[PDB]
Amino acid sequence: GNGKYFSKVGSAGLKQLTNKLDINECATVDELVDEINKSGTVKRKIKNQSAFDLSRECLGYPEADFITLVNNMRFKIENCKVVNFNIENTNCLNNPSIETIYRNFNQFVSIFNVVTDVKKRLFENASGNGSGGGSNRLEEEINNQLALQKS
């Protein structure tokens, strides 16, 4: 029997995704992709859903209010993934709902990190990140880091 039903970051995003995708459990994004790779419907849906959206859904935060949180935050984007973050304008935290969302925002980014990697793994590139350039502020900063990368 497997124990330790507690994980923060990384495998936590996997655990939330595997739960959401109704797939097998996964210890790494690499193994996660492989399971999804077996689940054709999930695989295709991961590209059909946007990383931001797919990840946000996994937590169950209200789209608008969740977006409201990240627009007022900033993020350390390491390798196209939010590795760290902090709130820039605590205006959104006026709502205890968003407080709840914020205090557990890392969960989202954990899941986001996963879908951000998985969507790259399954698809060499896809229009399923969030919106043009980026979802909402968060991915814009990511795209911003990518803009620094003059090809």
Side-chain angles (χ1 to χ4, degrees):
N2 186 32
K4 188 187 285 74
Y5 195 66
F6 224 65
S7 301
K8 297 181 182 179
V9 194
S11 299
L14 304 173
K15 176 59 186 176
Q16 279 294 89
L17 215 79
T18 56
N19 210 327
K20 264 272 289 176
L21 312 170
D22 299 281
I23 59 176
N24 295 325
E25 288 192 290
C26 306
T28 61
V29 157
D30 190 271
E31 296 164 83
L32 183 282
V33 175
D34 187 80
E35 303 304 312
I36 293 183
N37 211 330
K38 298 170 63 66
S39 301
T41 313
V42 166
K43 177 202 182 180
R44 302 171 182 126
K45 175 185 171 175
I46 311 256
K47 183 172 56 175
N48 206 213
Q49 214 66 31
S50 299
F52 184 85
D53 292 275
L54 199 163
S55 306
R56 159 263 159 177
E57 296 187 290
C58 304
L59 292 326
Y61 305 134
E63 182 185 84
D65 290 272
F66 176 74
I67 291 170
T68 297
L69 165 65
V70 314
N71 291 332
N72 292 272
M73 304 173 57
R74 275 315 221 278
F75 326 87
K76 178 184 179 59
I77 302 305
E78 188 58 89
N79 294 329
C80 302
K81 278 75 159 292
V82 25
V83 58
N84 258 272
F85 58 79
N86 65 274
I87 186 125
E88 188 197 72
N89 180 31
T90 58
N91 182 261
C92 49
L93 260 40
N94 180 268
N95 288 327
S97 192
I98 298 179
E99 269 181 312
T100 277
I101 303 179
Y102 173 69
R103 296 168 181 186
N104 289 327
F105 182 68
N106 178 270
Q107 310 291 272
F108 164 81
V109 311
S110 293
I111 304 175
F112 180 73
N113 264 263
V114 165
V115 191
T116 298
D117 199 293
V118 178
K119 110 279 181 69
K120 283 196 300 171
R121 243 143 165 145
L122 295 171
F123 327 102
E124 301 179 88
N125 181 270
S127 185
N129 59 275
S131 300
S135 46
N136 289 93
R137 187 59 60 205
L138 208 184
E139 283 193 311
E140 308 192 58
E141 289 292 82
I142 305 176
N143 197 31
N144 283 331
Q145 301 303 330
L146 299 181
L148 275 46
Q149 302 178 330
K150 293 171 63 279
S151 189

